[PDB]
Design a binder for this molecule. Structure first.
Ligand SMILES: NC(=O)c1ccc[n+]([C@@H]2O[C@H](COP(=O)([O-])OP(=O)(O)OC[C@H]3O[C@@H](n4cnc5c(N)ncnc54)[C@H](OP(=O)(O)O)[C@@H]3O)[C@@H](O)[C@H]2O)c1
Length: 318
């Protein structure tokens, strides 16, 4: 379908363009979800410590390795450093906890989950008595240096960023003494948040973009009935019908044809399989431009409790 399965990263490794998301996947369902995904062809799993389900994801990965359904070198496992671990002295331990839970001896890619550092401690969103999230002082260039050390210690093959705006990406690229460029910026992207400016910037610097919430995250916990709904948009349904595919399949193919990686989440076996069957059709340029035209700057993930943080990413235009 004029579509290779992997994209070359600036660390020299190849990354599967379609992965399985795991945010909100219940711990009692995610082991089967990941097993099914690997069985039906997925080779990339997107994880995070803050999702609280890495142990269960890891059970699935380990079983499929033990069963010899896949070899470790064929898998591309991604996780993310949570905001309460931006300190120099906490990054390695946070990575190692993720490795121990996923039952891996390296990650293919480790991302700074958000540019905002928070006070370390047990709470993922530490609050002051008035409800503000308590920041860390550690600046993100120092967090990046700590990520670089993980490459040099063999814990991770690639490092990257997530939810960074273009000025924050530029800060990393302009870092004095930069040793490794970010390989990936993982950002929200779908027809209602098309991200042209940030995607162009990242791609022009050789940074691969991964699109999260490609279906508009209908299970996001703050969903309101009045919100827009990609899967129910009749205009997108019409493009899907024309191609004899589902709306979800169109929504997944869309970022693929922008040279993005995409990570739809499901715990439903039939949908996991459906979502992978996107290498057998092509959207036209006109389809692509039409889908881009639906942009409304609508965000699933605004980190809305953190808008006063000095490194909050979404005040900038892009
Ligand atoms: N870096 C970040 O800050 C960040 C933020 C958000 C997301 N992410 C990553 O991106 C992944 C994907 O984003 P997301 O989880 O927000 O949402 P999403 O992938 O846009 O949507 C997931 C929702 O769509 C449903 N669904 C999946 N396939 C479907 C299909 N074929 N037909 C109908 N409904 C379908 C799922 O239901 P069922 O599961 O019940 O089947 C679930 O409710 C996350 O899981 C996470 O790995 C990263």
């Amino acid at each position: 379908s004029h579509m290779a399965s992997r994209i070359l990263l600036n660390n020299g490794a190849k990354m599967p363009i379609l992965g399985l998301g795991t945010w909100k996947s219940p711990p009692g369902q995610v082991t089967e979800a990941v097993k099914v995904a690997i069985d039906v062809g997925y080779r990339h799993i997107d994880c995070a410590h803050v999702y609280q389900n890495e142990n269960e994801v890891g059970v699935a990965i380990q079983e499929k390795l033990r069963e010899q359904v896949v070899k470790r070198e064929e898998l591309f496992i991604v996780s993310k450093l949570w905001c309460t671990y931006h300190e120099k002295g906490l990054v390695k331990g946070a990575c190692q906890k993720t490795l121990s839970d996923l039952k891996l001896d390296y990650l293919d890619l480790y991302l700074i989950h958000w540019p905002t550092g928070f006070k370390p401690g047990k709470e993922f969103f530490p609050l002051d008595e008035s409800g503000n999230v308590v920041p860390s002082d550690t600046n993100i260039l120092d967090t990046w240096a700590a990520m670089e050390e993980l490459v040099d210690e063999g814990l991770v093959k690639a490092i990257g960023i997530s939810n960074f705006n273009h000025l924050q990406v530029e800060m990393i690229l302009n870092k004095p003494g930069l040793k490794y460029k970010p390989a990936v910026n993982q950002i929200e992207c779908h027809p209602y948040l098309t991200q042209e400016k940030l995607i162009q910037y990242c791609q022009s610097k050789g940074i691969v973009v991964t699109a999260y919430s490609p279906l508009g995250s209908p299970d996001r916990p703050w969903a309101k009935p009045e919100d827009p709904s990609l899967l129910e948009d009749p205009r997108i349904k019409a493009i899907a019908a024309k191609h004899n595919k589902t709306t979800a399949q169109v929504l997944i193919r869309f970022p693929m044809q922008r040279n993005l990686v995409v990570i739809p989440k499901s715990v439903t076996p039939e949908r996991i399989a459906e979502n992978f069957k996107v290498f057998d059709f092509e959207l036209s340029s006109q389809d692509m431009t039409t889908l881009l035209s639906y942009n409304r700057n609508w965000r699933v993930c605004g980190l809305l409790s953190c808008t006063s943080h000095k490194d909050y990413p979404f005040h900038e235009e892009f």
